[PDB]
Amino acid sequence: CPLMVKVLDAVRGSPAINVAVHVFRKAADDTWEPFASGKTSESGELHGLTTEEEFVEGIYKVEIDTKSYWKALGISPFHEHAEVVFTANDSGPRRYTIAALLSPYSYSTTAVVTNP
Amino acid sequence: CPLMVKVLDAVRGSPAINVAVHVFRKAADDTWEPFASGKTSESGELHGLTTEEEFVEGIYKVEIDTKSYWKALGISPFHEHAEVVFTANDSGPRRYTIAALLSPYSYSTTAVVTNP
Amino acid sequence: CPLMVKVLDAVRGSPAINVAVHVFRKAADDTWEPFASGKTSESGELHGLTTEEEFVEGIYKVEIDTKSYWKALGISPFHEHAEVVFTANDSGPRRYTIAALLSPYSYSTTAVVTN
Amino acid sequence: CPLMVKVLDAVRGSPAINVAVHVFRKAADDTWEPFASGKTSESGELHGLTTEEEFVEGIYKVEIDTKSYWKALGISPFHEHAEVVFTANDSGPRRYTIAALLSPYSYSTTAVVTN
Numbered sequence: 410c411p412l413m414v415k416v417l418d419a420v421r422g423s424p425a426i427n428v429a430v431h432v433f434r435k436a437a438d439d440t441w442e443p444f445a446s447g448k449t450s451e452s453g454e455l456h457g458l459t460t461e462e463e464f465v466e467g468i469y470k471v472e473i474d475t476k477s478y479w480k481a482l483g484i485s486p487f488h489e490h491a492e493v494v495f496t497a498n499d500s501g502p503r504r505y506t507i508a509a510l511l512s513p514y515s516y517s518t519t520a521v522v523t524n525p
Numbered sequence: 526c527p528l529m530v531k532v533l534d535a536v537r538g539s540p541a542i543n544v545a546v547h548v549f550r551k552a553a554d555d556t557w558e559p560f561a562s563g564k565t566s567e568s569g570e571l572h573g574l575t576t577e578e579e580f581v582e583g584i585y586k587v588e589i590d591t592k593s594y595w596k597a598l599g600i601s602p603f604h605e606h607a608e609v610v611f612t613a614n615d616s617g618p619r620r621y622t623i624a625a626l627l628s629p630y631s632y633s634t635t636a637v638v639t640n641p
Numbered sequence: 642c643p644l645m646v647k648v649l650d651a652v653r654g655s656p657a658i659n660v661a662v663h664v665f666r667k668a669a670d671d672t673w674e675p676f677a678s679g680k681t682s683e684s685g686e687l688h689g690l691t692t693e694e695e696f697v698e699g700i701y702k703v704e705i706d707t708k709s710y711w712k713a714l715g716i717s718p719f720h721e722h723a724e725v726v727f728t729a730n731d732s733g734p735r736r737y738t739i740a741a742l743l744s745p746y747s748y749s750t751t752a753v754v755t756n
Numbered sequence: 757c758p759l760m761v762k763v764l765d766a767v768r769g770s771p772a773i774n775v776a777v778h779v780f781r782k783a784a785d786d787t788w789e790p791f792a793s794g795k796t797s798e799s800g801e802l803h804g805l806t807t808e809e810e811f812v813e814g815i816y817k818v819e820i821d822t823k824s825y826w827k828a829l830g831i832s833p834f835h836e837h838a839e840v841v842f843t844a845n846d847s848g849p850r851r852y853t854i855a856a857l858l859s860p861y862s863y864s865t866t867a868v869v870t871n
């Protein structure tokens with residue numbers, strides 16, 4: 410609920426299904442510790458990554474495995490992945506949706522941040 | 526259900542609320558006849574524009590009133606509106622979502638088309 | 642030149658070459674009158690559309706024939722065309738670049754307005 | 757030059773000027789080693805990062821310091837930075853332009869790869 414990832418495919422005009430997503434959180438020693446991971450559904454959405462308790466203040470990295478997506482579809486894309494890096498929950502809990510729109514040589518990403 | 530419009534604001538990181546949307550359909554004489562209109566909700570979504578019966582094959586124009594949106598927020602933007610023009614239902618009924626991501630001098634639009 | 646149009650292809654990662662572009666100016670009766678046109682070059686650019694003298698304040702529409710571009714590449718696209726509609730304003734900077742990034746079911750456009 | 761980076765501002769409709777850009781090359785041990793850096797010019801461009809000799813095949817990361825850019829304009833942004841990660845491949849065209857379009861809560865990036 411606190412963190413959701415939606416992915417769309419600009420070539421097909423569809424949700425981007427079965428996209429692997431890995432989330433990391435910056436540790437006190439400045440390394441990127443694994444936080445959560447999952448795959449987008451048939452709707453292009455990934456829910457259930459974390460809980461309000463576990464999703465504390467910090468710097469998070471959402472890595473969307475765009476190359477693995479395009480290669481699973483038999484296409485040779487430009488980027489390795491799309492990375493979204495942001496400070497979260499620094500003014501108390503918020504709900505974050507990270508959205509991405511994918512093409513083989515381009516991608517756009519935006520955030521929708523709401524206060525419960 | 527057959528036609529939905531979602532609008533997001535890239536400056537605020539939020540849904541774009543209260544955005545006026547006008548839909549037109551090309552008539553047999555090549556003019557743009559009014560088809561439907563409405564405003565985005567607090568979620569940035571506009572539902573209820575049309576029915577499966579009324580939404581026949583044709584060329585449709587979805588005009589998103591981006592200038593009126595930015596000016597209602599006291600901002601002077603570049604574009605008059607964003608226009609999305611497409612042939613619909615030419616291989617039988619489909620469900621269309623027209624999405625747009627807005628900035629004062631830029632916007633992206635994509636379609637998600639599904640077969641029920 | 643006061644107005645440049647640049648078109649890019651997000652599928653191939655290249656300029657979008659030989660794309661037809663039509664520019665219209667809004668007339669007093671709210672109809673769109675032909676203003677300038679051309680085809681993008683090998684660099685995806687279209688220069689020479691107008692001059693400082695002719696490009697007066699007003700509402701302009703740049704129509705990019707995206708459907709023909711995709712069909713020539715053997716790809717089925719969503720949109721009939723991409724349209725960019727804006728007001729030219731003398732108080733702002735002098736030079737307008739209208740950029741468009743094309744995919745089969747999506748496009749993005751931005752304006753880069755400089756002196 | 758084999759590698760150009762161009763940064764644009766979607767709020768003001770302008771080049772994004774004086775933005776710090778850092779380029780890294782992936783090392784054999786999977787760490788990111790500094791490769792080239794600079795600040796975008798008045799045209800939002802950063803030329804001169806590398807040469808044909810130095811820009812061998814491999815995985816590169818271009819990090820754009822978007823947070824500092826927005827803060828200097830007095831705007832609160834979402835991202836820490838924008839990152840563009842890609843493989844340089846000799847079979848493809850020779851010249852890579854990495855373009856980024858910035859908004860406070862969003863960015864877009866494309867690659868224009870030509871000969």
Ligand SMILES: O=S(=O)(F)Oc1ccc(-c2nnc(-c3cc(Cl)c(O)c(Cl)c3)o2)cc1
Pocket residue numbers: 415417508509510517518519531533570622624625626633634635
């Ligand atoms: O959950 S619904 O709103 F119903 O269906 C939708 C869910 C999500 C989206 C959506 N979210 N972001 C976008 C989206 C994101 C980017 Cl970077 C973009 O360039 C464009 Cl044109 C759209 O679309 C659009 C529709």
Ligand SMILES: O=S(=O)(F)Oc1ccc(-c2nnc(-c3cc(Cl)c(O)c(Cl)c3)o2)cc1
Pocket residue numbers: 515631647649740741742749750751760762764853855856857864865866868
């Ligand atoms: O010599 S170059 O600077 F490379 O030629 C170029 C000139 C302009 C652009 C360019 N300007 N805006 C964009 C561009 C525009 C849109 Cl809507 C966008 O989504 C993205 Cl990711 C980039 O690309 C890219 C290349």
